[PDB]
């Protein structure tokens, strides 16, 4: 069929979701940023959830 | 040449048994 | 528990209780007369290969579905024809073939078209629907036929 | 004994002006991630540099407002200054005044100049005049600090606080491999990519992590 | 395990000889396919019933004397979005069964191969990749059957039947007789309703 | 780029079944013969260079017999 | 009771600590499972079930290597392997495999 | 041992045999890595016996699957010994309980 | 924009293994920095010296058993890996054991030798439960890092697994810290528990040593 074989399953999908899960009233919530890197400094520093 | 392959250790125990009548040389 | 019912599909198994079909129109083809299973040799011969090749797909599929599992119709319709290669001869015409014989539908078919080539009469003839067994067993080559099983008797 | 393998630095690859990668090999094993775990946070948290804090127009006061004649919002004018690169050579704090009048882009040209700032890149804008008559006028403070010190934490009733990204870097990461010299094969493969603001090349940022990592532990050492 | 072994053995073995050998047979002829639903959820929508098949005939949208898609085109995603879009009812594709070639099939007729994403090219064997298309999920979920822990899969049957999305009442091949109450009582063994929307 | 996948290689061909361009001449040419590569080398083995010159377009099955017909004259 | 077992030990009760990385020295977001489980060494040792073979001896009434790790003889390409390569359409590999 | 078990393991071990259980009480008067002497109590002698008892253990033999089958005393001079008490450790045991 | 670099402030010693060293002061976000390195480097990198080859006079092989020795060769070779010992300016060193009768054989009877310290006089080797039976073995003590399986390195010399590293467990752990009426600082307390060979100090500095020698390649030329 038209569907592909190589899926992520177990581990990355269990990793890839709860990096895309929101939550509500996290630490760093409500800021402006100027693109994914800033959000990547951001998470790695801890400054923000 | 008769011990196997990649599996290596210690001799820990001979045993010998030969033919009745004949005479044990050596070792034996 | 349902994988027996795609064994039986694909050997073209009797119902044991079939259906009762309108041979001639008159009632039109291919009409029921009493209810019940639906014969694949007798939808085929009143039908047409593509009414049979759709019974067969779409039972297929509907025992395949439950389970979840996705397979094209494509492969199962490449099964079907497969199954369905011999040809009963009806009327010999011009040609070398008599009466009624089971023979390859590719031969007949170039017989005809060179039959039609010569200005001369060409022969007349009806499928034949055959199971997976059956039909591998009965083909042109023997040692393919030997390979899959009952050796003695083909050899 | 006492001796371990040294690298040398096998190999810097400069993708464009401010992305780079740097590799060595060979390590000691599990050195690697100390080494790289160190530098990334020295490198994210702790380099100093100077960058714009804080920002005033007369027009506008409060964050969320409106101001016409300005295609880009007060979001992106905000944003648009914290992106922007200054260095500083000689003064702690800076006042920078900014006007524009007219239709079409502004730009980091059309800030009045002063004795001590630089702009590395002038092509940066800031917004987009659509209006002929309107003008802006705007004031914007430049601090020299460490590290990234967001507006939240810390809260004059135009001011208007811009997050400080005071340190170069931009973006650092790094990975392990494994490496092997003959009849050894626990060895590591340390890969940094980095990737600055413009205002140091990164291999000079680099260079100021392991100094700043080298006089911290300059008490301990017994040599 | 050994049942599945050996109907995917015979399977391969009397579909091991046909391969795609010519490029066009030139047949006008094919089976109707149309979207299938059971009870209110669409299974298989038309878009993948007909997802890389070549159009037989007759493929004109819902609009007297003009022609959406011309004929002998394989369908593309873009076209299955052209005839969602105008939503097409049911189309006729030409189907391997139905082909004129001697000893084997010809690429046009079986249409996509699903592996590489276009059309089919010369000389690849079609019959062991059915057989083991058809013969691999059945021995797998056979294997897999303890995962679920032997747990009886017995859905209850239902008693009634309720309409999820309001249209008209349909009844097809019904043959039915009215009671006392006045309600239709069915008298025939394959009564079909289908729901149609206004 | 070209060890990992061979798509581009395909598309100057366009049957992937065509293979026996890449290895039954070219490749057997380079590893037997005195025949000399087209492109640079860079330490690759054989078969890869050749999949390498059909994906840039200097190798294909007419150049190939044109080729063998110009050494066919003495 | 396991509970209670827990908390005369000065252990938390829910069974479940903070741990850290070990690379990094950063805490784990949410709180791990850790404990005692008893673990066996099951007599599959990969030590004896590797095996490779080049050339060595073979059959006598059909000439093809033998079967087995102890007589040093290769794997058993069956009928499902060559029904797999032709589906693939790999007509040399199959060839070499049979013949060669 | 087992750090959570069912208090199955004692009558498996003692069942099976690779252990060396005290037929009759006493002192031990003497233990090796390879020999046990008991001194049995005076009602438990035979009127002409002497009143010892001497065990022999097994030391590196292989097993059917090519496992090793050892023993180990587990007591010390001088100890009080009843009837049933394990005296020596089978492979696979720890102080007469079933160790995997 | 001044940055204040540590000094080791004070060393504490609850016993003889335990042992808590800080640092003070650190800016912020160099305590966490300094720590995990500091573990990764000592629990790895530390050396020592361990016991690789035993030699008995009355044995051939570890599989083997003596008269008058309760226990087996192979948990002879087991309580001898874990013996404690400090060398002074020797690679290696051979220390002798002989005793006879009934007792604990214990590292306490190993021959008083002048440069050679044993930290546990009683730690226990074997035990002996015959009058006429006497145990006599030599031993060789080297000195690295790390873990040297046997395997990776005349009948009767038994070869031993070599644990070099001395230390067993470190934990750091970060605090608030007043020093000049600044709270940006804090402080760093380790906590190290080894065998009792290496002193916590040479430790801590031998670790920063390496550190700073790794940083030296970090300087791009
Ligand atoms: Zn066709």
Redesign the interface.
Same mark, same amino acid.
């Given at each position: 069929?038209?569907?592909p074989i190589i899926v992520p399953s177990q581990d990355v999908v269990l990793g890839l979701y709860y990096m895309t899960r929101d939550c509500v009233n996290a630490k760093?919530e409500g800021?402006?940023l100027?693109g994914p890197?800033?959000a990547?400094?951001?998470y790695?520093?801890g400054?923000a959830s | 040449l008769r011990v196997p392959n990649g599996v290596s250790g210690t001799v820990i125990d001979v045993q010998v048994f030969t033919r009745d009548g004949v005479e044990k040389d050596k070792r034996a | 528990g349902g994988l027996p019912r795609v064994a039986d599909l694909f050997e073209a198994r009797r119902p044991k209780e079939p259906a009762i079909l309108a041979e001639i129109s008159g009632v039109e083809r291919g009409d029921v007369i009493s209810d019940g299973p639906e014969a694949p040799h007798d939808i085929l011969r009143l039908r047409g290969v593509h009414a049979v090749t759709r019974y067969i797909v779409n039972e297929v599929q509907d025992v395949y579905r439950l389970q979840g599992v996705?397979?094209?119709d494509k492969h199962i319709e490449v099964i079907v024809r497969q199954m369905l290669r011999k040809a009963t001869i009806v009327n010999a015409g011009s040609s070398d073939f008599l009466e009624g014989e089971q023979v390859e539908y590719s031969r007949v078919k170039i017989a005809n078209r060179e039959l039609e080539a010569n200005g001369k009469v060409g022969a007349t003839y009806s499928r034949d629907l055959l199971g997976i067994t059956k039909a591998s067993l009965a083909t042109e080559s023997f040692i393919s036929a030997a390979s899959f099983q009952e050796t003695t008797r083909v050899l | 004994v006492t001796e371990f393998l040294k690298p040398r630095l096998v190999d810097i690859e400069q993708v464009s002006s401010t992305h780079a990668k740097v590799t060595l090999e060979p390590l000691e094993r599990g050195f690697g991630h100390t080494l790289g775990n160190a530098l990334?946070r020295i490198l994210? &948290?702790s380099m100093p540099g100077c960058a714009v804090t804080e920002v005033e127009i007369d027009g506008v006061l409060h964050e969320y407002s409106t101001k016409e004649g300005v295609q880009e919002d007060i979001?992106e004018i905000?944003?648009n200054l914290?992106?922007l690169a200054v260095r500083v050579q000689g003064k702690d704090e800076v006042i920078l005044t900014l006007n524009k009048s007219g239709i079409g882009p502004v730009t980091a040209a059309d800030i009045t100049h002063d004795g001590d700032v630089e702009i590395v890149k002038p092509q940066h804008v800031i917004c987009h005049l659509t209006d002929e008559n309107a003008s802006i006028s705007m004031r914007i403070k430049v601090q020299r600090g460490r590290?990234?010190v967001?507006a &939240?934490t810390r809260i004059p009733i135009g001011r208007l606080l811009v997050?400080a990204?005071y340190s170069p870097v931009?973006?650092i990461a790094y990975n392990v491999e494994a490496a092997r010299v003959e009849q050894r094969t626990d060895l590591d493969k340390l890969v940094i990519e980095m990737?600055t603001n413009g205002t140091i090349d990164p291999e000079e940022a680099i260079r100021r992590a392991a100094t700043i990592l080298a006089e911290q532990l300059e008490a301990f050492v017994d040599l | 395990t050994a049942n599945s072994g050996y109907l995917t053995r015979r399977l391969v073995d009397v579909a091991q000889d046909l391969v795609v050998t010519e490029d066009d047979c030139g047949t006008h002829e094919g089976i109707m396919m149309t979207p299938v639903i059971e009870g209110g959820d669409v299974k298989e929508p038309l878009r993948?019933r007909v997802?890389?098949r070549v159009t037989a005939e007759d493929v004109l949208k819902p609009g007297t004397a003009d022609i959406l898609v011309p004929r002998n085109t394989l369908l593309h995603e873009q076209w299955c979005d052209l005839l969602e879009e105008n939503s097409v009812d049911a189309v006729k594709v030409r189907s391997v069964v139905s082909c004129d070639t001697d000893f084997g099939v010809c690429a046009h007729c079986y249409g996509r191969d699903?592996a590489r994403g276009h059309i089919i090219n010369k000389g690849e064997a079609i019959g062991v990749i059915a057989a083991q298309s058809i013969g691999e999920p059945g021995t797998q979920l056979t294997m897999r059957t303890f995962h679920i822990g032997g747990a009886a899969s017995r859905a209850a049957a239902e008693s009634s039947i309720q309409v999820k999305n309001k249209g008209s009442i349909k009844l097809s091949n019904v043959k039915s007789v009215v009671n006392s109450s006045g309600k239709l009582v069915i008298t025939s063994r394959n009564t079909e309703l289908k729901l149609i929307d206004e | 780029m070209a060890r990992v996948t061979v798509q581009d290689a395909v598309e100057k061909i366009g049957n992937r079944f065509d293979l026996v361009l890449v290895a039954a001449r070219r490749a057997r040419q380079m590893q037997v013969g005195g025949k000399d590569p087209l492109v640079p080398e860079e330490n690759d083995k054989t078969t890869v260079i050749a999949l390498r010159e059909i994906e840039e377009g200097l190798i294909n099955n007419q150049i190939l017999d044109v080729r063998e017909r110009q050494e066919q004259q003495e | 009771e396991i509970k209670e077992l827990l908390k005369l030990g000065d252990l938390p009760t829910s069974g479940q600590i903070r741990l850290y990385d070990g690379r990094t020295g950063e805490q784990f977001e949410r709180p791990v499972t850790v404990g005692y489980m008893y673990m066996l060494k099951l007599n599959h040792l990969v030590d004896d079930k590797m095996h490779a073979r080049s050339t060595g001896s073979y059959s006598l009434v059909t000439q093809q290597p033998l079967g087995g790790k102890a007589q040093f003889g290769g794997q058993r390409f069956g009928e499902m392997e060559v029904w797999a390569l032709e589906a693939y359409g790999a007509a040399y590999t199959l060839q070499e495999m049979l013949t060669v | 041992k087992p750090l959570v078990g069912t208090g199955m393991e004692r009558a498996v071990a003692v069942d099976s045999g690779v252990t060396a259980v005290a037929k009759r009480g006493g002192v031990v008067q003497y233990v090796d890595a390879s020999r046990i002497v008991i001194k049995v109590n005076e009602d438990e002698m035979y009127p002409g016996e002497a009143g010892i008892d001497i065990y022999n253990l097994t030391k590196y033999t292989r097993s059917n699957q090519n496992t090793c089958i050892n023993q180990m005393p587990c007591v010390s001079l001088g100890e009080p010994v009843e009837r049933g008490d394990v005296l020596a450790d089978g492979p696979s045991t720890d102080l007469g309980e079933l160790a995997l």
């Amino acid at each position: 069929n038209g569907e592909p074989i190589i899926v992520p399953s177990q581990d990355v999908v269990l990793g890839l979701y709860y990096m895309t899960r929101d939550c509500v009233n996290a630490k760093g919530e409500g800021m402006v940023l100027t693109g994914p890197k800033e959000a990547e400094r951001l998470y790695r520093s801890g400054l923000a959830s | 040449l008769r011990v196997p392959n990649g599996v290596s250790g210690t001799v820990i125990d001979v045993q010998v048994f030969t033919r009745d009548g004949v005479e044990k040389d050596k070792r034996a | 528990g349902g994988l027996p019912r795609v064994a039986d599909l694909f050997e073209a198994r009797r119902p044991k209780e079939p259906a009762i079909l309108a041979e001639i129109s008159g009632v039109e083809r291919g009409d029921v007369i009493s209810d019940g299973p639906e014969a694949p040799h007798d939808i085929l011969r009143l039908r047409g290969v593509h009414a049979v090749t759709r019974y067969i797909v779409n039972e297929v599929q509907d025992v395949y579905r439950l389970q979840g599992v996705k397979i094209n119709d494509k492969h199962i319709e490449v099964i079907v024809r497969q199954m369905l290669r011999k040809a009963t001869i009806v009327n010999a015409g011009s040609s070398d073939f008599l009466e009624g014989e089971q023979v390859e539908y590719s031969r007949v078919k170039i017989a005809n078209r060179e039959l039609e080539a010569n200005g001369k009469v060409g022969a007349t003839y009806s499928r034949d629907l055959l199971g997976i067994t059956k039909a591998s067993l009965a083909t042109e080559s023997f040692i393919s036929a030997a390979s899959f099983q009952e050796t003695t008797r083909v050899l | 004994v006492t001796e371990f393998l040294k690298p040398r630095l096998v190999d810097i690859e400069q993708v464009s002006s401010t992305h780079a990668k740097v590799t060595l090999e060979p390590l000691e094993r599990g050195f690697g991630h100390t080494l790289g775990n160190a530098l990334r946070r020295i490198l994210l &948290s702790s380099m100093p540099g100077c960058a714009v804090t804080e920002v005033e127009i007369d027009g506008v006061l409060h964050e969320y407002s409106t101001k016409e004649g300005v295609q880009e919002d007060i979001l992106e004018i905000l944003l648009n200054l914290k992106g922007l690169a200054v260095r500083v050579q000689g003064k702690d704090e800076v006042i920078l005044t900014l006007n524009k009048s007219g239709i079409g882009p502004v730009t980091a040209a059309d800030i009045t100049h002063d004795g001590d700032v630089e702009i590395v890149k002038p092509q940066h804008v800031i917004c987009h005049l659509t209006d002929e008559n309107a003008s802006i006028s705007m004031r914007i403070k430049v601090q020299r600090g460490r590290g990234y010190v967001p507006a &939240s934490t810390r809260i004059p009733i135009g001011r208007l606080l811009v997050d400080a990204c005071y340190s170069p870097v931009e973006r650092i990461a790094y990975n392990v491999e494994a490496a092997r010299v003959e009849q050894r094969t626990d060895l590591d493969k340390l890969v940094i990519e980095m990737e600055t603001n413009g205002t140091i090349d990164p291999e000079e940022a680099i260079r100021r992590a392991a100094t700043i990592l080298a006089e911290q532990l300059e008490a301990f050492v017994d040599l | 395990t050994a049942n599945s072994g050996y109907l995917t053995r015979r399977l391969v073995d009397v579909a091991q000889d046909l391969v795609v050998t010519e490029d066009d047979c030139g047949t006008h002829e094919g089976i109707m396919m149309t979207p299938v639903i059971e009870g209110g959820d669409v299974k298989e929508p038309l878009r993948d019933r007909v997802l890389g098949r070549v159009t037989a005939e007759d493929v004109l949208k819902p609009g007297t004397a003009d022609i959406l898609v011309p004929r002998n085109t394989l369908l593309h995603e873009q076209w299955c979005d052209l005839l969602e879009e105008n939503s097409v009812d049911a189309v006729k594709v030409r189907s391997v069964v139905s082909c004129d070639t001697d000893f084997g099939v010809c690429a046009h007729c079986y249409g996509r191969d699903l592996a590489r994403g276009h059309i089919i090219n010369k000389g690849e064997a079609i019959g062991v990749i059915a057989a083991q298309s058809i013969g691999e999920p059945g021995t797998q979920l056979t294997m897999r059957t303890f995962h679920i822990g032997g747990a009886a899969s017995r859905a209850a049957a239902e008693s009634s039947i309720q309409v999820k999305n309001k249209g008209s009442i349909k009844l097809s091949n019904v043959k039915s007789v009215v009671n006392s109450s006045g309600k239709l009582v069915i008298t025939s063994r394959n009564t079909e309703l289908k729901l149609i929307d206004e | 780029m070209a060890r990992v996948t061979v798509q581009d290689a395909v598309e100057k061909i366009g049957n992937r079944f065509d293979l026996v361009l890449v290895a039954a001449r070219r490749a057997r040419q380079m590893q037997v013969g005195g025949k000399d590569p087209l492109v640079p080398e860079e330490n690759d083995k054989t078969t890869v260079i050749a999949l390498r010159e059909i994906e840039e377009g200097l190798i294909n099955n007419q150049i190939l017999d044109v080729r063998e017909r110009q050494e066919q004259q003495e | 009771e396991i509970k209670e077992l827990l908390k005369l030990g000065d252990l938390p009760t829910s069974g479940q600590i903070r741990l850290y990385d070990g690379r990094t020295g950063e805490q784990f977001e949410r709180p791990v499972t850790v404990g005692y489980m008893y673990m066996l060494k099951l007599n599959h040792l990969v030590d004896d079930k590797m095996h490779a073979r080049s050339t060595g001896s073979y059959s006598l009434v059909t000439q093809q290597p033998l079967g087995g790790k102890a007589q040093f003889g290769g794997q058993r390409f069956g009928e499902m392997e060559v029904w797999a390569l032709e589906a693939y359409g790999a007509a040399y590999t199959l060839q070499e495999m049979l013949t060669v | 041992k087992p750090l959570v078990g069912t208090g199955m393991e004692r009558a498996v071990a003692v069942d099976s045999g690779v252990t060396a259980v005290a037929k009759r009480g006493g002192v031990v008067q003497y233990v090796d890595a390879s020999r046990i002497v008991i001194k049995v109590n005076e009602d438990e002698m035979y009127p002409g016996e002497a009143g010892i008892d001497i065990y022999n253990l097994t030391k590196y033999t292989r097993s059917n699957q090519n496992t090793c089958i050892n023993q180990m005393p587990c007591v010390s001079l001088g100890e009080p010994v009843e009837r049933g008490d394990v005296l020596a450790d089978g492979p696979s045991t720890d102080l007469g309980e079933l160790a995997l």
